[PDB]
Design a protein around this ligand. Structure first.
Ligand SMILES: [Mg+2]
Ligand SMILES: [Mg+2]
Ligand SMILES: [Mg+2]
Ligand SMILES: [Mg+2]
Ligand SMILES: [Mg+2]
Ligand SMILES: [Mg+2]
Ligand SMILES: [Mg+2]
Ligand SMILES: [Mg+2]
Ligand SMILES: [Mg+2]
Ligand SMILES: [Mg+2]
Ligand SMILES: [Mg+2]
Ligand SMILES: [Mg+2]
Ligand SMILES: [Mg+2]
Ligand SMILES: [Mg+2]
Ligand SMILES: [Mg+2]
Ligand SMILES: [Mg+2]
Ligand SMILES: [Mg+2]
Ligand SMILES: [Mg+2]
Ligand SMILES: [Mg+2]
Ligand SMILES: [Mg+2]
Ligand SMILES: [Mg+2]
Ligand SMILES: [Mg+2]
Ligand SMILES: [Mg+2]
Ligand SMILES: [Mg+2]
Ligand SMILES: [Mg+2]
Ligand SMILES: [Mg+2]
Ligand SMILES: [Mg+2]
Ligand SMILES: [Mg+2]
Ligand SMILES: [Mg+2]
Ligand SMILES: [Mg+2]
Ligand SMILES: [Mg+2]
Ligand SMILES: [Mg+2]
Ligand SMILES: [Mg+2]
Ligand SMILES: [Mg+2]
Ligand SMILES: [Mg+2]
Ligand SMILES: [Mg+2]
Ligand SMILES: [Mg+2]
Ligand SMILES: [Mg+2]
Ligand SMILES: [Mg+2]
Ligand SMILES: [Mg+2]
Ligand SMILES: [Mg+2]
Ligand SMILES: [Mg+2]
Ligand SMILES: [Mg+2]
Ligand SMILES: [Mg+2]
Ligand SMILES: [Mg+2]
Ligand SMILES: [Mg+2]
Ligand SMILES: [Mg+2]
Ligand SMILES: [Mg+2]
Ligand SMILES: [Mg+2]
Ligand SMILES: [Mg+2]
Ligand SMILES: [Zn+2]
Lengths: 77, 252, 91, 135, 112
RNA sequence: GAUGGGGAAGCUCCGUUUCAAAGGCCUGAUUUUAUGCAGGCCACCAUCGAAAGGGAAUCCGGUUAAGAUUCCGGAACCUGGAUAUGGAUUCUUCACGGUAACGUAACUGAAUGUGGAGACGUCGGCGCGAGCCCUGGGAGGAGUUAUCUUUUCUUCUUAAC
RNA sequence: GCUUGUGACGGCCCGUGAAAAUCCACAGGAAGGAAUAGUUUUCAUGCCAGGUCGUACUGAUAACCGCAGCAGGUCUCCAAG
RNA sequence: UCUAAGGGUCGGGUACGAUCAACUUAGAACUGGUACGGACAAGGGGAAUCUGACUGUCUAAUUAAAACAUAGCAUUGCGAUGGUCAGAAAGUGAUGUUGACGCAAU
């Protein structure tokens, strides 16, 4: 139900006790008017809400993805 | 022979009153200490239409002398009493429109409404849109006051009996021709099942003392005795005279 | 463009009911629908709201009064008499 | 007089502090560059001393008599000028223009006026000024 | 073209059976029932819909923080501010005139 | 339509808050112990009566030979109950800010009182929303092509929350 | 444009067009509550639970009522060029 | 097949320009076996007499009328310890959440 943007505030969620699952979705999308790029949504399934963090930047993405809790059960795509 | 129409009304079935929409029964305050030793103030918090009544009602609220809270009475609004106006009720109350005083405390010629027959009966006389009673005089020893009702009837009552100064609003409602069946219809739709009326003369003999005949006609005198019996009384009951009232009326 | 010789508002009723009945009604309708002067705030913004109930556009005061007019002649002469009589009992 | 001067009591008549009583301590009778209106800087009483009685003893008395003050810049068209009047010398300095702007300044200010108002309540000076206006 | 059906059993157009059409991610029209509208709470004093106060159906007010049910000042969620201004003034003046009628008739009792 | 009642030979009739000693809650008092009494209220006095009136809260996709707002999947929400962690608040104890209308993530509140909502006709034009209808471009699939038509048809959707 | 929803208005009345459960708010301030550490679940997040009965289909020139698979009767929503 | 009239949006120191999008109406030519609201859709009119004013009502299943009702007009009863009406009775009931600008009865 909820969307998120503070990339630290998100990081805190990913370790918020009741969070067993997560999912990473990748989408082709366009930019301004010309070229395309690679959108990527970070979805933490809370017990009461499903949080999703859009990272527009492909670079920010990759480095974020590694930081994902090494105990967290993430579904890729 | 069938039971005739006026008899059927007594058993109250389709004939009862159409009561759902009505604001409440209108009554003066209960006759407590304050109202018969001093006065007590209220405020008309709203004047408002009562369904099937022709005069507006006035919701007027007071304090409970005995408990912390408001108690709201329902009054019949006299003419020219207005929202937010202060309302005074009591023996020792003042003589303006809207207030309510024992008839003992008002000079002759006072004009008052919703007047009690007995004290603390919370209003009985002159309540219909327009009417009032007039004080024609008092008699201090064995205390009474005499009034002339809307009927014209003189009648004397206890001077402790309360009245409210003024006449009742909505005067002249009966001046405007109803004009079409519908208005009468909607009129009674909020009173009772009294309309429209079949003439007994249009019915059969089972139906009425006026029923039958090969031409429509009453057949015998239609002045019926006081001592007549149920199912007999149709027409001009107890009538002591009859016909076009030639001449001025007005109680001598 | 004067619209009718004489029936005024009574036009709705067309030819029905008969002149006299309509005359009488026109009188009292013209009374009730009319807009009146407010005794309290001074603006003429009192229109009627059901038989007997006269209330004010702005300032929202409601005065009980005549069935189709704000002040009925009867109540008027009462007002004066209550004046008169009250006079006596303070002086 | 130009009756909105140094020590007038007045009742705030809008916004939170509505119905509460104040003292004028400084009057900007004409404008600010901001505050484009005649306006007073007042110290008022936000949470009055509750009543106290013989039944009240020792500490409960100490408790009942605590006062929550307040200070405010306010348009003249929000005070009822009152016939009453109380002295404002203890906190002339305390309630400044410069006292508003930057919160900590306002907090220390109220601290004084809190101690200022409570001294004044014991030995019932201005007794009226210490009783909620009811409405 | 595409038509639609009620979703509850009640077939009739009563206030509590308002409908509203809607396109789904299936790409088809379907009814959806629409609860009767909130009405704004009213200043129980002058009567106006009173400002600053969110507007729900009554039970739904228990599902909302108090800052949706008041404005700050005294008689907050209750009366219309301008209404309170009146309250304040009238109270003050009357309480004062109270005193003026005291010492005036207090003078009389001694001057007669 | 039961009840204290009143009629009636009786089946029963009347009455519904009415000539009635009509009841139950908040917690304190217990640290013999579970719940006696201590306050203080509240005198509202059965109940039945709406599958169209009032009314806490759910949606979209998928699935069956026959069920689906009920299963599956996903995402919500309400009510009762428990409860801790974070935040807020406090040395000026019970939030600040804004002249003000008012703001907010919070920001103690018993009895008692009061206010709102629930909650309300009908017709008329005006204004706006939604869905439908009409239509340009492009991206597809279809039909007609002796002849003519950058064509004719169709797909291009987005729930509650 | 069509249908529906809604708003600010206006016309009408001797017609002025339910009730109750229920939810909230306010006035009140009984009480209770901190500096060696208090108060706070109307902010957020977190934990458990939600019973009973109905849910098929017809709703009509054949599933209902008219002796019947009767040209009759029988409340309603959606509505293309 | 032509013509004229009726609109929207922008920038102008403190007269005009630019484009976008609507069927309404009136006029003018041409044109045909004089037809053209081409199907569908869709009032006969007039002069009087009788009778009920009107809209409304009824004999389901032989009478829809001039019959009933109606507004309007007039008469009667009644101030509650009451009028009129209900019940076998009654600490019973309708009008009555009522009060003569009312209720009841012709
Ligand atoms: Mg009744
Ligand atoms: Mg009838
Ligand atoms: Mg008759
Ligand atoms: Mg008749
Ligand atoms: Mg006959
Ligand atoms: Mg006879
Ligand atoms: Mg006979
Ligand atoms: Mg006969
Ligand atoms: Mg005859
Ligand atoms: Mg407070
Ligand atoms: Mg299509
Ligand atoms: Mg269904
Ligand atoms: Mg409707
Ligand atoms: Mg808000
Ligand atoms: Mg608010
Ligand atoms: Mg019984
Ligand atoms: Mg029930
Ligand atoms: Mg129901
Ligand atoms: Mg229902
Ligand atoms: Mg489905
Ligand atoms: Mg199955
Ligand atoms: Mg099915
Ligand atoms: Mg599921
Ligand atoms: Mg789930
Ligand atoms: Mg909960
Ligand atoms: Mg804060
Ligand atoms: Mg209430
Ligand atoms: Mg209400
Ligand atoms: Mg309703
Ligand atoms: Mg929903
Ligand atoms: Mg329709
Ligand atoms: Mg209205
Ligand atoms: Mg509310
Ligand atoms: Mg105590
Ligand atoms: Mg919560
Ligand atoms: Mg249970
Ligand atoms: Mg089904
Ligand atoms: Mg079938
Ligand atoms: Mg058949
Ligand atoms: Mg043009
Ligand atoms: Mg010409
Ligand atoms: Mg006829
Ligand atoms: Mg006819
Ligand atoms: Mg027949
Ligand atoms: Mg027969
Ligand atoms: Mg006919
Ligand atoms: Mg026939
Ligand atoms: Mg006739
Ligand atoms: Mg005649
Ligand atoms: Mg008896
Ligand atoms: Zn006025």
């Amino acid at each position: 139900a909820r969307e998120i943007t503070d990339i630290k505030q998100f990081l805190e969620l990913t370790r918020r006790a009741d969070v067993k699952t997560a999912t990473v979705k990748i989408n082709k999308k366009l930019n301004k008017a010309g070229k395309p790029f690679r959108q990527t949504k970070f979805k933490v399934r809370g017990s009461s809400s499903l949080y999703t963090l859009v990272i527009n930047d492909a670079g920010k993405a990759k480095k974020l993805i590694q930081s994902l809790p090494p105990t967290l059960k993430v579904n890729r795509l | 022979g069938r039971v005739i129409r006026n008899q059927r009304k007594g058993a109250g079935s389709i004939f009862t009153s159409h009561t759902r929409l009505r604001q409440g029964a209108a009554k003066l305050r209960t006759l407590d200490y304050a109202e018969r030793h001093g006065y007590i103030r209220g405020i008309v918090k709203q004047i408002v239409h009562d369904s099937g009544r022709g005069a507006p009602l006035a919701k007027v609220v007071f304090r409970d002398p005995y408990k912390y809270r408001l108690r709201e009475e329902i009054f019949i609004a006299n003419e020219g009493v207005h929202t937010g106006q202060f309302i005074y009720a009591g023996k020792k109350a003042s003589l303006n429109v809207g207030n309510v005083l024992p008839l003992g405390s008002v000079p002759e010629g006072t004009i008052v409404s919703n007047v009690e027959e007995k004290p603390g009966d919370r209003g009985a006389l002159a309540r219909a849109s327009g009417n009032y009673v007039i004080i024609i005089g008092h008699n201090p020893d064995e205390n009474k006051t005499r009034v002339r009702l809307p009927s014209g009837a003189k009648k004397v009552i206890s001077s402790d009996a309360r009245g409210v100064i003024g006449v009742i609003a909505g005067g002249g409602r009966v001046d405007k021709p109803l004009l079409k069946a519908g208005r009468a219809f909607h009129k009674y739709r909020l009173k009772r099942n009294s309309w429209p009326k079949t003439r007994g003369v249009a019915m059969n003999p089972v139906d009425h003392p006026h029923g039958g005949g090969n031409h429509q006609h009453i057949g015998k005198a239609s002045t019926i005795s006081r001592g007549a019996v149920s199912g007999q009384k149709a027409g001009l009951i107890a009538a002591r005279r009859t016909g076009l009232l030639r001449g001025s009326q007005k109680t001598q | 463009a004067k619209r009718t010789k004489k029936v005024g508002i009574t036009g709705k009723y067309g030819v029905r009911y008969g002149s006299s009945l309509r005359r009488q009604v026109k009188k009292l309708e013209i009374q009730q629908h009319a807009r009146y002067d407010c005794s309290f705030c001074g603006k003429k913004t009192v229109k009627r709201g059901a038989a007997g109930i006269w209330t004010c556009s702005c300032c929202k005061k409601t005065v009980a009064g005549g069935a189709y007019t704000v002040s009925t002649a009867a109540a008027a002469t009462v007002r004066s008499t209550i004046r008169r009589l009250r006079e006596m009992v303070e002086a | 007089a130009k009756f909105l001067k140094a020590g007038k009591v007045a009742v705030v008549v809008r916004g939170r502090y509505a119905g509460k009583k104040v003292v004028i301590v400084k009057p900007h009778d004409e404008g600010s560059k901001s505050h484009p209106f005649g306006h007073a800087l007042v110290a008022g009483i936000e949470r009055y001393p509750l009543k106290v009685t013989k039944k009240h003893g020792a500490k409960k008395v100490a408790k009942r008599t605590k006062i929550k003050p307040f200070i405010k810049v306010v348009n003249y068209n929000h005070l009822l000028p009152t016939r009453y009047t109380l002295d404002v010398e203890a906190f002339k300095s305390v309630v400044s223009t410069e006292t508003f702007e930057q919160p900590s300044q306002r907090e220390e200010a109220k601290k004084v006026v809190k101690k200022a108002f409570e001294e004044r309540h014991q030995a019932g000076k201005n007794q009226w000024f210490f009783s909620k206006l009811r409405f | 073209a595409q038509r639609v059906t009620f979703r509850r059993r009640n077939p009739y157009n009563t206030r509590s059976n308002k409908i509203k059409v809607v396109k789904t991610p299936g790409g088809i029209l379907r009814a959806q029932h629409v609860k009767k509208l909130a009405t704004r709470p009213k200043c129980g004093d002058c009567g106006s819909a009173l400002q600053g106060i969110s507007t729900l159906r009554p039970r739904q007010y228990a599902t909302v923080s108090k800052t949706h049910k008041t404005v700050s000042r005294a008689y907050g969620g209750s009366r219309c501010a301008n209404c309170v201004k009146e309250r304040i003034i009238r109270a003050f003046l009357i309480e004062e005139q109270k005193i003026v009628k005291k010492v005036v008739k207090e003078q009389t009792e001694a001057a007669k």
